[PDB]
Amino acid sequence: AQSVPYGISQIKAPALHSQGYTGSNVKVAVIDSGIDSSHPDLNVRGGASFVPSETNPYQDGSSHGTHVAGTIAALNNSIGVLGVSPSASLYAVKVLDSTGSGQYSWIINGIEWAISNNMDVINMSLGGPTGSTALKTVVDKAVSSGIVVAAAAGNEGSSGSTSTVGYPAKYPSTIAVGAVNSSNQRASFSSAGSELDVMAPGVSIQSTLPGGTYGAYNGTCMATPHVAGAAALILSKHPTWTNAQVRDRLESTATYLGNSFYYGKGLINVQAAAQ
Amino acid sequence: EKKYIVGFKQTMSAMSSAKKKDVISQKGGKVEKQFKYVNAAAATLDEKAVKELKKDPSVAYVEEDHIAHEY
Ligand SMILES: [Ca+2]
Ligand SMILES: [Ca+2]
């Protein structure tokens, strides 16, 4: 039997599925530690690896990329879980090794791959506290090319009025994604700052793990794929909408939660956004 | 040596697949990759190479190739 993780219901993705919209033909790059494409609850259509010591993108020694992939597009069937956009085409763009670490140049190579292979959506459930000119340039280019880029805001919590939002989420072109629990409360680890754009479920998020298993993790990284999948749903229903239009709808129709320093525009509502 | 990203000025030289390589390669630097969409290159550099590069009319910046982590 299939379970529907609470976060998937929380952003109102099932309403889109009932309308007949599930992310079909929308190409989503998972720029992460790889995706174990042997998982029976996942379909992976392609990808590439820029991690020098781990050149097969369909192997994931961290589990992070597989878990993110399942929140985005775990298959709608009789097993495991359900992703936000279960018919989306997933691409394994491996830029982190099995420890979940990656050089910025590898990440850039992964983003450039996404550009060159006409991805519709990029998910980056990763960041660091350091900025990079090359990184900004590449993310800005992906966005000016028409690609939706969702980035984890970071898990550095709050520090008085100083922004703890990491990179590349800090840059204006990306959609920075914070984390809320099932009560719509900000998780205390979720980074804060005026760069925050939206929140999504990021506490106790059940999804796919390598080896055909399932498990829950917490993080703005688990929150991010909710937003990448939301984008996939919206574009499967509005295939002419640009990335800026997708973003504007996700933010303008978000459920207000409070002070935008801690919550951005609030919790995404994919049902409202895709009206 | 360290892991760096070397960026180039829009047209004030070096972009070209070869003068880019050349630019870094002839300061001790070593190139692992030339970015397709970014006017930059991932390279390995000693301290001398950094100083020379930063001061090249073709170079806009010399930044450390930082290490991110799963968020
Ligand atoms: Ca399933
Ligand atoms: Ca941003």
CATH code of the domain covering residue B52: 3.30.70.80
Please provide the DSSP assignment of chain A as one string.
-----HHHHHTTHHHHHHTT-S-TT-EEEEEES---TT-TT--EEEEEE--TT---TT--SSSHHHHHHHHHH---SSSS---SSTT-EEEEEE-S-TTSEEEHHHHHHHHHHHHHTT-SEEEE-EEBS---HHHHHHHHHHHHTT-EEEEE--S---BTTB----BTTTSTTSEEEEEE-TTSPBPTTS--STT--EEEE-SSEEEEETTTEEEEE-SHHHHHHHHHHHHHHHHHH-TT--HHHHHHHHHHTSB--S-HHHHTT-B--HHHHT-
Instruction: Give me A232's structure tokens.
Output: 């996939």
- Which positions in chain B touch A103 (Cβ < 8 Å)? 3, 42, 65-68
Cβ-contact A84, A226 below 8 angstroms = yes
Phi-psi region of A5 (alpha: psi -120 to 50; beta: other; left: phi over 0): beta
Q: Which of A119, A92, A101 is nearest to A25 (CA)?
A: A119
Residue of A nearest to B39 (CA): A134
CA A129 – CA A136 distance, rounded (Å): 13
Residues, Cβ < 5 Å to ion ligand 1: A 2, 41, 75, 77, 80
Q: How many residues does chain B have?
A: 71
Distance A176 CA to ligand 2 centre (A): 4
Phi, psi of A251 (to 5 degrees): -80, -40
Pairing of β A198-201 and β A44-49: unpaired
Instruction: Give me A143's structure tokens.
Output: 């966005």
Taking every pair of Cα atoms in chain B, the longest distance, rounded to a whole number of angstroms, is: 38
Q: What distance in Å separates residue B4's CA from the closest CA in chain A? A: 9
Handedness of CA A143, A146, A152, A158 (dihedral sign): positive
Cβ-contact A114, A122 below 8 angstroms = yes
Note whether A153 contacts B: Cβ–Cβ < 8 A.
yes
> Which one of the ligands is nearest to A197 CA?
2
Q: Which of A156, A100, A116, A110 is nearest to A134 (CA)?
A: A110
Q: Cβ contact (<8 Å) for A103 and B3?
A: yes
Note whether A224 contacts B: Cβ–Cβ < 8 A.
yes
| CATH of the structural domain A1-275, one choice from 1.20.120.920, 3.40.50.200, 3.40.50.1000, 2.60.40.420 | 3.40.50.200
Distance A95 CA to ligand 2 centre (A): 20
- From the list A126, A138, A141, which residue is nearest B70 (CB)? A126
Note whether B70 contacts A: Cβ–Cβ < 8 A.
yes
CA A273 – CA A250 distance, rounded (Å): 5
CA A228 – CA A198 distance, rounded (Å): 12
Structural domain boundaries enclosing B70: 1-71
User: What's the number of CA atoms in the CB half-sphere (13 Å) around residue A55?
Assistant: 1
User: How many beta carbons lie within 10 A of that of residue A78, not counting itself?
Assistant: 7
Taking every pair of Cα atoms in chain A, the longest distance, rounded to a whole number of angstroms, is: 47
Q: Cβ contact (<8 Å) for A220 and B71?
A: yes
Collapsing DSSP states into helix, strand and coil, what is residue B55? Answer: coil
Give the type of residue at A12. Answer: K
Note whether B7 contacts A: Cβ–Cβ < 8 A.
yes
Angle at B38 between CA A154 and CA A32, to 5 degrees: 35
Order of strands across the sheet that contains A44-49? A44-49, A89-94, A27-32, A121-124, A148-152, A175-180, A198-201
Phi-psi region of B25 (alpha: psi -120 to 50; beta: other; left: phi over 0): alpha
- From the list B35, B39, B70, which residue is nearest A96 (CB)? B70
Q: Which residue has the tokens 């640009």?
A: A242
Cβ-contact A152, A166 below 8 angstroms = yes
Q: Which residue has the tokens 């003068």?
A: B19
Cβ-contact A111, A66 below 8 angstroms = no
DSSP conformational letter for B16? S
User: How many beta carbons lie within 10 A of that of residue B65, not counting itself?
Assistant: 21
Q: What distance in Å separates residue A4's CA from the closest CA in chain B? A: 23
Give the type of residue at A94. Answer: K
Q: What distance in Å separates residue A263's CA from the closest CA in chain B? A: 17
Q: Cβ contact (<8 Å) for A125 and B63?
A: no
Resolution reading in Å? 2.0
Q: Cβ contact (<8 Å) for B35 and A109?
A: yes
How many domains in chain B?
1
CA A184 – CA A132 distance, rounded (Å): 33
Domain regions of chain A by residue span? 1-275
CA A273 – CA A236 distance, rounded (Å): 13
